[PDB]
From Swiss-Prot:
HAMAP family cross-referenced by the UniProt entry: OGT
Active-site positions on this chain: 128
Main localization, broad class: cytoplasm
Note in the entry: This enzyme catalyzes only one turnover and therefore is not strictly catalytic. According to one definition, an enzyme is a biocatalyst that acts repeatedly and over many reaction cycles.
Gene name as annotated: ogt
Source species, domain of life: Archaea
Purpose: Involved in the cellular defense against the biological effects of O6-methylguanine (O6-MeG) and O4-methylthymine (O4-MeT) in DNA. Repairs the methylated nucleobase in DNA by stoichiometrically transferring the methyl group to a cysteine residue in the enzyme. This is a suicide reaction: the enzyme is irreversibly inactivated.
Catalytic activity of the protein: a 6-O-methyl-2'-deoxyguanosine in DNA + L-cysteinyl-[protein] = S-methyl-L-cysteinyl-[protein] + a 2'-deoxyguanosine in DNA; a 4-O-methyl-thymidine in DNA + L-cysteinyl-[protein] = a thymidine in DNA + S-methyl-L-cysteinyl-[protein]
EC number: 2.1.1.63
GO biological process: DNA alkylation repair; DNA repair; methylation
One GO cellular component term noted in the UniProt record for this chain: cytoplasm
Stated name of the protein: Methylated-DNA--protein-cysteine methyltransferase
NCBIfam families: ogt
Family as reported in the entry's similarity comment: Belongs to the MGMT family.
Amino acid sequence: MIIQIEEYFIGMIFKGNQLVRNTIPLRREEIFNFMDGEVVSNPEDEHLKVAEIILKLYFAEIDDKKVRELISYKLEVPEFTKKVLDIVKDIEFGKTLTYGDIAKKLNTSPRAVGMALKRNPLPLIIPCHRVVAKNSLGGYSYGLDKKKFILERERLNMVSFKFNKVY
């Protein structure tokens, strides 16, 4: 479950063929003491292949839907997350709005939706970035610097399909 790469310790944990929680960046190099049993996750293939994938969508360079290699997530929600998830299904790299318009879109409010995408079990897939506060930027657990970079990166570098017209 625990794995160090580049400058982040990814906590990928699943119940088999379905994800549940896989996140966390760098912090304590000796964090290996916070788990007397794991400290592996089988770095061989299963980890390298996924690692590059995760970092891929991160630096806006995954292309396509991407909703697959990230493994299907199940359960895990901080008071709410289903509604917000419905948001990703629509918004992609290019949209940006707050919680108000989102929550109101389903049947709730930006208050409950806040804690939702906030402690989302899978931040590297959920459009929490495209959900700022009234003013600008609104995060507590990881973000700001990254959310800033990813916010500008997405807008920049527009990837378009190939012009293949066969009449």
